[PDB]
């Protein structure tokens, strides 16, 4: 039989994200559009199937 | 038979996200759009099926 | 049988992302478009299937 | 049988991304287009199947 | 049987990307086009199948 | 049987990319075209199959 | 049997790319074309199959 | 059996590319063409198959 | 059996490319053509098969 | 059996390319043609097969 | 002295400050000192025998973090 | 003195400051001192025998982080 | 003195500052001192015998991080 | 003194500053001192015997990071 | 003094500064001091015997990073 | 003094600065001091015997990085 | 003094500066001091015997990086 | 003084500067000092015997990088 | 003084500068000092014997890079 | 003084400069000092014997790069 002593496994992982912002100046003017300027960390693992969205941020959907 | 002694497994995990913002200035003016500027951490694991949205932030949906 | 003593495995992983911004000035003016200017870390692992979007940020979809 | 003692494996990994921006000035004016100017780290691993988008940022889709 | 003692393997990996920008000035004016000027790190590994896009940034798709 | 003691293997890897820009001035004016001027690091490894795009940045697709 | 003690192998690798730009001035005016002026590092390894594009940047596709 | 003690192998590798640009002035005016003026490092290794493009930058495709 | 102790092999490699440009002035005016004026390093190794393009930069394809 | 102790082999390699340009002035005016004036280093090694282009830069293809 | 002033604004913020001194900050930081982790073993037959006479013996997995301000620190000490 | 002033703006921010001194910051930083990790072993028959008389013996996996301000620090010490 | 001023703007920011001194910053940095990692072993029959008389003996996997301000630091010391 | 001024702009930023001194910054930096990593071994029969009398002996995988400000630092010391 | 001024612009930035002094920066830098890595061994029969009397002996894989400000530093020292 | 000025521009940037002094920068740089890497061995029968009396002996894979400000530094020292 | 001025431009940049002094920069640079790498060996039967009496002996793979400011530095030293 | 001026341009850049002094730059540069690399050996039977009495002996693969500011530096030294 | 001026241009650049002094630059440069590389050997039977009494002996592959500011530097020194 | 001027051009560049002094530049340059490379040997039976009494002996592959500012530099020195 199979033995697993002290074994580690990572699948779809995100680890260690550091960010710093000192004395920064930002000016935005948006009209009917998207503007994104932030930290985003996403991890997904799908065994089977379809139509799985892990994350959706800052979007403008206007389908017809 | 199978033995698992002291074994570890990660699947779809997000770990360790650090952020700092000191003395920052931001000015935003939005009209009918999306603006995102924040920390976002998302983790998903789907065995099967479909149509599974883990997270949706800062969006403007106007379907017809 | 198979033995796994002290074995490690990474599949679809993102690790160690550091960012710093000191005394930076940014001015944006968007009209009906996309502007992205932020840290983004994404990790995916799909065994089978289709139609799996891990992350979607700063977009403008106007299908007809 | 197979033995794995102290063995390591990386597949689809992104590791160690450092960025610094000091005293930088940026001015953007966008009309109905895309402008991207940010750190992006993406890692994917697909065993089988199709139609898997790991990340999509700063886009303008207007299909007919 | 096969033994793997202290063995390492990298497949589709991106490691060690450093960037610095001091006292830089940039001015952009875009109309209905794409402009990209940011760090991008992407890693992919596909065992089989098709139609797998790891990353898509700063694009303008207007199919008919 | 095969032994692998302390053996290393790299396949599709990108490692060590350093960039510096001090006191640089850039002025761009784009109309309905593509302009790219940023660091890009991409690594791919495909065992079999087809139609796999690792990265696509700064493009303007208008098929008919 | 085969032994691999302390053996190294590189296949499709890109390593060590350094770039510096001090006090440089650039002025671009594009109309419906492509202009590229940035660091790009790409590494690919394909065992079999076809239709695999590792990277595509700064292009204007208008097929009919 | 075959022994590999301390053996090294490179296949399709690019290593050591250094570039410097001090006090340079460039002025470009493009109309419906391609202009490329940046560092590009590409490495490919294909065991078998066809239709594999490692990198494509600064192009204008208008097939009929 | 074959022994490989401390043996090295290079196949399709590019190594050591240094470039400097001080106080240079360039003025370009392109109409519907290609102009290339940048460092390019490319390395390929193909065991078998066909239709493998390692790199394509600064081109204008208008087939009929 | 064959022994390889401390043996080196180069096949298809390009090594050591240095370039300097100080106080140079260039003025180009292109119409529907190709102009190339940059460093280019290319290395190829093909075991068998056909139709393998390592690099193509600054070209204008208009087949009928 | 420092002076700040915002006028005729829909949104405004005026901040002024004299002498200032920042402090230490630790966000998401890890520190290990004297730690042992990840020890895996597989055996069929193990025999261990220790025989001590008038001495000091330390054995097994062990982590220590001593901090002796005055005097002698030792893991094992045997002074006759 | 420092002076800042914003006028006739829909959004405005005026900040002024005199002497300033920043501090230390640690974000997402790791530090190891005296650490042992990743030790894997496979054996069939193990025999270990230690025989000490009037001495010091240290053995096995061990991590130590000593910091003796005054006096002598030693892992094993045997003074007759 | 420093003076900054923004006028007749929809969005404006005026910042002024006198003397300034930045501080240390550590983002995503790693440091190892006295560390042992990645030790793998495979054996069939292992025998280990230690025999100490009036001495110091250190053995096995070991990591140490000593910092003795005054006095003598030693891993193993045997003074008669 | 330094003076900055922006007028008649939809977006404007005026910044002014006198004396300034930057500080140290570490982003994504690694440092190893006294480290041992990647040690792999395969054997069939191992025998190890140590026999010490009135001396110092150090053996096995070992990492040390000593920093003695005043006094003598030694891994193994045997003074009669 | 330094003076900067932007007028009649849709987007403008005026920055002025007097004396300035930059600082050290480390981005993505690595440093090794006293390190041992990548040691692989394959054997069938190994025998090791050490016999010490009143001396110092150091053996095995070893990494050290000593920094003695005043006094004598030695890996192994045996003074009678 | 330095003076910069931009007028009648859709986008403009005016920067002025007096005395300036840049600092050190390290991006993607590596440094090794006292390092040992890549040691591979294959053997069938190994025998090692050391016999020390009142002396210093150092052996095996070893990396050292000593930095003695005042006093004598030595890997092995044996003073009678 | 230095003076720069841009007028009647859609995009403009005016920069002026007085005295300036650049600093050191290191991008993608490597440095080795006291390093040993790439040592491969194949043998069938190895015998090693060392016999020291009142002396200093150093052997095996060894890398050292000493930097003694005042006093004598030596790998092996044996003063009677 | 230096004067630069651009007028009536769609894109313009005016830069002016007084005294200027550049600094050192290192891009993609390598440096080795005291290094040993690429040593391969194949043997069937190896015998090595060292016998030291009251002397200094250094042997094996060795890399050293000494930098003694005041005092005598030596790899091996034996003063009676 | 220096004067530059561009007028009535779609794209223009005016640069002016007074005194200027360039600095050192190193791009893609290599330097070796005290290095040994590429040593290959094949043998069947090797015997090596060293016998030292009250002297200095250095042997094997060796690379050194000494830099003694004041005092005597020697690889091997034996002063009675 | 120097004067440059471009007028009525679609693209123009006017540059002017006073006193100027260039600096050293090294692109793709190599330098070796005290180096040994490419040493290959094949033998069947090798015997080496060294017997030193109160002297200095250096042997084997050796590279040295000494730089003694004041005092005597020697590879081997034996002063009675």
UniProtKB/Swiss-Prot annotation, chains A, B, C, D, E, F, G, H, I, J:
Region 4 X 11 AA tandem repeats of [EGS]-K-T-K-[EQ]-[GQ]-V-X(4), annotated ranges: 1-32
PTM comment: Phosphorylated, predominantly on serine residues. Phosphorylation by CK1 appears to occur on residues distinct from the residue phosphorylated by other kinases.
Known outcome of mutating residue 15 to Q: In PARK1; no effect on protein structure; no effect on phosphorylation of the protein; no effect on membrane- and lipid-binding; increases oligomerization; increases fibril formation; increases secretion of the protein; impairs copper-binding
Effect of residue 4 to F: No effect on osmotic stress-induced phosphorylation
Binding-site positions, Cu cation: 15
UniProt subcellular location: Cytoplasm; Membrane; Nucleus; Synapse
Tissues expressing the protein: Highly expressed in presynaptic terminals in the central nervous system. Expressed principally in brain.
Sequence repeat ranges, renumbered to this chain: 7-21, 22-32
Modified residue annotations for Phosphoserine: 52
Quaternary assembly: Soluble monomer. Homotetramer. A dynamic intracellular population of tetramers and monomers coexists normally and the tetramer plays an essential role in maintaining homeostasis. Interacts with UCHL1. Interacts with phospholipase D and histones. Interacts (via N-terminus) with synphilin-1/SNCAIP; this interaction promotes formation of SNCA inclusions in the cytoplasm. Interacts with CALM1. Interacts with STXBP1; this interaction controls SNCA self-replicating aggregation. Interacts with SNARE components VAMP2 and SNAP25; these interactions allows SNARE complex assembly and integrity.
Family affiliation: Belongs to the synuclein family.
Disease: Genetic alterations of SNCA resulting in aberrant polymerization into fibrils, are associated with several neurodegenerative diseases (synucleinopathies). SNCA fibrillar aggregates represent the major non A-beta component of Alzheimer disease amyloid plaque, and a major component of Lewy body inclusions. They are also found within Lewy body (LB)-like intraneuronal inclusions, glial inclusions and axonal spheroids in neurodegeneration with brain iron accumulation type 1. Parkinson disease 1, autosomal dominant: A complex neurodegenerative disorder characterized by bradykinesia, resting tremor, muscular rigidity and postural instability. Additional features are characteristic postural abnormalities, dysautonomia, dystonic cramps, and dementia. The pathology of Parkinson disease involves the loss of dopaminergic neurons in the substantia nigra and the presence of Lewy bodies (intraneuronal accumulations of aggregated proteins), in surviving neurons in various areas of the brain.
Functional summary from the UniProt entry: Neuronal protein that plays several roles in synaptic activity such as regulation of synaptic vesicle trafficking and subsequent neurotransmitter release. Participates as a monomer in synaptic vesicle exocytosis by enhancing vesicle priming, fusion and dilation of exocytotic fusion pores. Mechanistically, acts by increasing local Ca(2+) release from microdomains which is essential for the enhancement of ATP-induced exocytosis.
Comment on protein domains: The 'non A-beta component of Alzheimer disease amyloid plaque' domain (NAC domain) is involved in fibrils formation. The middle hydrophobic region forms the core of the filaments. The C-terminus may regulate aggregation and determine the diameter of the filaments.
The protein's name in its UniProt record: Alpha-synuclein
UniProt source species: Homo sapiens (Human)
Gene giving rise to this polypeptide: SNCA
Residues of the full protein shown: 36 to 99 of 140
